[PDB]
């Protein structure tokens, strides 16, 4: 079978690598690539991606564009995020991804999530899923904002920093801090966080911050990528525990 990655940018996606590598250790034929699509000329190039690839995941910017072209899950469907396909069917992972990550963990409430993207989404519904009720949403777009029907309140970027002062949990799921970016919340407002989670694969100048100032729990990116791989793999009918936990256990430590 064939699988890739899709998105844009997804050049540097880590995904193939580790694919690759775990088909290769668990002696199977499989395969996993990379197709870097601009948001301009989805609707033509992800008709060849359905015609040549068994399954794939999708990242930005395409996890909700590519639901049209899938037959989702009813999960996925109050997500409006599909991150993994096999053969016609769009599911989510991600927020699997989240609720496995904080395994062993009590998320304390209010908790702050950053962004209304996809990734947000996939966070919302696996803290709601894990019995959270205070979540506070803080984003950029009007746009994102509007397609939100979650039982969230709404700030703007502006107010994160008075908002996560009054919040004991805080998740990054937007790009920000990708490139080494910081966000608009104070040493002062992070202190006394209980959590501070952050989606991004590597550290990120929160992840840095929460460090510093003692935070109970400091998680990237790296569990929630863990776990939504274990999730693809089970979907696609080629999970092997043994294999994985070998391949992909890299990526925590």
Request: with cysteine; aromatic share 12%; glycine share 8%.
């Amino acid at each position: 079978m064939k699988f890739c990655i899709i998105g844009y940018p997804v050049r540097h996606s880590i995904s193939p690598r580790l694919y690759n590598e775990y088909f290769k250790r668990a002696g199977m034929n499989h395969s996993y690539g990379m197709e870097e699509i601009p948001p301009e000329s989805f609707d033509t190039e992800i008709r060849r991606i359905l015609e040549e690839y068994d399954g794939f995941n999708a990242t930005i910017p395409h996890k909700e564009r590519v639901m049209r072209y899938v037959e989702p899950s009813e999960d996925a469907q109050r997500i409006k995020a599909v991150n993994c396909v096999f053969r016609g069917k769009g599911y989510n992972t991600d927020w699997v991804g989240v609720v496995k990550s904080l395994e062993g963990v009590e998320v304390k409430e209010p908790v702050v999530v950053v962004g209304a993207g996809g990734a947000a989404r996939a966070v919302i519904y696996a803290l709601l899923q894990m019995g959270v009720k205070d979540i506070w949403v803080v984003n950029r777009t009007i746009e994102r904002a509007k397609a939100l029907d979650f039982p969230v309140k709404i700030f703007s970027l502006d107010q994160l920093d008075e908002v996560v002062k009054k919040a004991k949990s805080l998740f990054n799921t937007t790009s920000v801090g990708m490139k080494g970016e910081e966000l608009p919340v104070s040493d002062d407002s992070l202190k006394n966080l209980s959590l501070v989670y952050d989606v991004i694969y590597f550290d990120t100048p929160l992840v840095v911050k929460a460090r510093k100032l003692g935070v109970k729990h400091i998680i990237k990116g790296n569990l929630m990528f863990y776990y939504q791989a274990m999730e693809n793999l089970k979907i696609w009918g080629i999970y092997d525990e043994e294999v994985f936990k070998e391949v992909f256990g890299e990526v925590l430590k």
